[PDB]
Design a protein around this nucleic acid. Structure first.
Lengths: 60, 50, 123
RNA sequence: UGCUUGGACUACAUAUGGUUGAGGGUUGUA
RNA sequence: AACUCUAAGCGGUGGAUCACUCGGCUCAUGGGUCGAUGAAGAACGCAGCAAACUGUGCGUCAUCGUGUGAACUGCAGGACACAUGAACAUCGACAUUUUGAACGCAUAUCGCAGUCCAUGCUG
RNA sequence: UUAUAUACAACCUCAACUCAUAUGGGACUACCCCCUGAAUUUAAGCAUAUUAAUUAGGGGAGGAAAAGAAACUAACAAGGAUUUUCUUAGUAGCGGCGAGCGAAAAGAAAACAGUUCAGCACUAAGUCACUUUGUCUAUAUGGCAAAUGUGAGAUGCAGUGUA
RNA sequence: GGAAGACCGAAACAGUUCUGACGUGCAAAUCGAUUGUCAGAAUUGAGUAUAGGGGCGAAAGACCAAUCGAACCAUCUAGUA
RNA sequence: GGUAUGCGUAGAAGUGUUUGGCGUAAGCCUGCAUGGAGCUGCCAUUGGUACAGAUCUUGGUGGAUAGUAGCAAAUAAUCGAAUGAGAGCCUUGGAGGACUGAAGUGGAGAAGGGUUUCGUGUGAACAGUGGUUGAUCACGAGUUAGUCGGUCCUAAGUUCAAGGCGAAAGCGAAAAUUUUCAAGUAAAACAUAAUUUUGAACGAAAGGGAAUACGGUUCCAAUUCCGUAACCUGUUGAGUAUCCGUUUGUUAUUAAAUAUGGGCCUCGUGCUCAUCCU
RNA sequence: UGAAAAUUUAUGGUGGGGACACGCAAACUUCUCAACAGGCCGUACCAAUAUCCGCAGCUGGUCUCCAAGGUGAAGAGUCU
RNA sequence: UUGAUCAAAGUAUCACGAGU
């Protein structure tokens, strides 16, 4: 999941996460929660483990 | 519903994020005049239309 | 961690500055975790101070990005638009004052030979 | 080459030059 | 003792009196300040716990320099980087999302473009 | 160079440009400016009068705006640019001579500032603006020459000369 | 053999007589019995025209946002008696 | 504005009053009880100056009634268990009676709603009765797409380039006249050639129209998420009729060769004839 | 006498480009087949005797979609 | 007598050539 600025053109996330974490995207999904926030959805690659991602970052 | 537009999705957050009550400590300012809100929306005693 | 006095930052270089830039925004995003996860202090409240610390960097980075322009854009006409003295409206586009006192020939010969003389006509 | 990501750009009416000009308009040199 | 009539005490619905007023309108002297470099108005995005009023514009409740010279405060927490400035006000520096007189074609559509370099992958 | 059979050079009207380089619609409005011009009301009614050369009227300005240097007065022992105030005066005339309207030079007070255009004769374009290159500096759409590089300029630029 | 603005009838609509049920309602017009058309001059969701002394009217001065022989909203409006 | 060496936290203004009194009367003086910061008397002036009234404006509040009017349409609810301070309900879950009758009080779509959908927690107004659950608050989450669809096309029509008119704003307008008011078109000198009339755009989640569905899945989401199974549009890449008579394979018959012939010539080796599918 | 137009096929067409036969092939090839991305936003729920408009949770007007057993002419009307 | 035709052939003299 991700929460982003309001012009996320679905490839900036494809640009940024590999720029910030070297993470291969799989399918970048987007919805806008109607309180004014663009909740994001991205899928990992196979070698990257999701529990290894945030534990590297610090999100429990 | 369900076929809104990108004003009335962003307009409808502002007439949603303004629907809290008072901040739940700020009646301990100096000169507290704020009991509960002026703009306070229910949705059958108050309409939107603007 | 010390307040970056902008008087200090006027000696640095832009390559060090962008190195100084990303060294803080990368740590900044980790602080927002504690805002949403409820991190280990009551608040990791440095995102007020480091915010204005970050904003202290852009301007002085822009300053030498501005100050280098107007010295190499010296000695031309047809000046850059965003660098053209944004003063007013009602005295820019109406007859510049070195050029609106350009007196006329038949009005600078009647101001030559009969001058105003500073006397006192009295008994 | 095409993709996506940045920028700069790209109103109209309009004034004085600049360039390229169009004219069984008006002649001239042939 | 019921009840109804009547005075005062006393409790009770009430907000009038008088006082008090970080405000109103009137009186008069001062000064020229209105945008193609983006005004006026709006929409939003704002901040630690935040809806507003007020402040702003991705540097987002403030901002360089400046001045004065220690705090804002319900609280936590950072400061004392006063001593090389707290917090104010001033304000010249830089900034100025979004829209107008829309300076791309254009709006019950964040839609359609077009030119050119830059920057990544095609390769 | 035109049996509508070619060039080139001008000219003349006249285009097109992601050219260069720059100026403008808009906001406000009390005051101000050129505009358009209605009505209850008053006449005991109403129709010309009145409300009024008025509220919307909207196009335009500014710290001033418009006016202003008389094609005026007055008719006298003369005066003398424009604007506001006192008075001329609620008088002159306009008026269904109804209601009601309505000035004015002249008299005194503030302030005071007078002059370029056109057009004989003014008598070697002696003009003006861009350009580029330097002078000189300056947050100048800048000062000095130059190549006399353009073009504007005789279909007239300049100086002197104006009710 | 299945044509006609043909008939009795249902959701679609209309609104007749009861002058019946509440008439401080269920309501600033509705409920309940009753009655008419019902394969076209039919019924209708959206888009678009039409404008205040006019739009529109298979014509009653109906209808124009609960207003219609002129709306509706601020002024000249403390308009006159 | 003048004035009384004016009283005032040792109680000043109004508020009550079964204390006492003065006037003909309007009105004061006075005692007590609140009350907490300012007030009156003579004489000059004076302003938005004293109220029972205006079908008067505004704000409390009566009798009737503060318990009367009536909360009567849609068949009709019921014992037992919970829990709960407390239940005819709703709040459940156990039975089991009857309704809605498939042109439903049922399952999902439009306009309009705008956080109601969901869990968790609950005290008071809120639910014309209660309330332990609620379309109320408190507090948390929650809407994923190349294929569904807006997006393109155009419909009646907005009159929306400057020909025009108006004092200007703007025009209850088939703006068909507006140097070229051409989209241009791989283009050729020497307005590229006959060509194009209105130049522009909006206008339909009901018409036109790239292409998909199936199974399960969460506290609420699915032609979207995973599992699995196709397609479209664009781009790039690889293979893909296409090697002949003859003779390299093969003695020839044959075979790579999509089907070779031909005259000549010593046969032809030479020569000639040629494939843009059968 | 029963809309337009975006997009689209095939055909016609003069030119022009392929185009040797001892082959090497090639083919916006309208064939087979592999890599490669496809942005933008709208999605929860009521969808009306309790979320609409009816000053209100009010018998009131609200666009269509699916639509069963029996009796029976039947989408009637009674009944599960 | 419900097809159909566009996009120069012909001609002439020059280019009267270039390559060769």
């Amino acid at each position: 999941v991700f929460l982003t600025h309001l012009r996320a053109n679905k490839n900036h996330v494809r640009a940024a996460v590999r720029k910030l974490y070297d993470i291969k995207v799989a399918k970048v999904n987007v919805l806008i929660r109607p309180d004014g926030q663009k909740k994001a959805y991205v899928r990992l690659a196979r070698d990257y483990d999701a529990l290894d991602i945030a534990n590297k970052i610090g999100i429990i | 519903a369900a076929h809104k537009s990108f004003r009335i999705k962003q307009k409808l957050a502002k007439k949603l994020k303004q629907n809290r009550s008072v901040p739940q400590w700020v009646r301990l300012r100096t000169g507290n005049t704020i009991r509960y809100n002026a703009k306070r929306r229910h949705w059958r005693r108050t309409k939107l239309k603007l | 961690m010390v307040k970056v006095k902008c008087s200090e930052l006027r000696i640095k270089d832009k390559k060090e500055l962008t190195k100084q830039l990303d060294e803080l925004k990368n740590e900044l995003l980790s602080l927002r975790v504690a805002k949403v996860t409820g991190g280990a202090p009551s608040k990791l409240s440095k995102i007020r101070v480091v915010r204005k610390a970050i904003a202290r960097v852009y301007i002085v980075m822009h300053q030498k990005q501005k100050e280098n322009l107007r010295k190499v854009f010296k000695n031309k006409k047809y000046k850059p638009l965003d660098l053209r003295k944004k003063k007013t409206r009602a005295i820019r586009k109406a007859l510049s004052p070195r050029d609106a006192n350009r007196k006329t020939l038949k009005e600078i010969r009647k101001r030559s030979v009969f001058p105003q003389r500073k006397f006192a006509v009295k008994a």
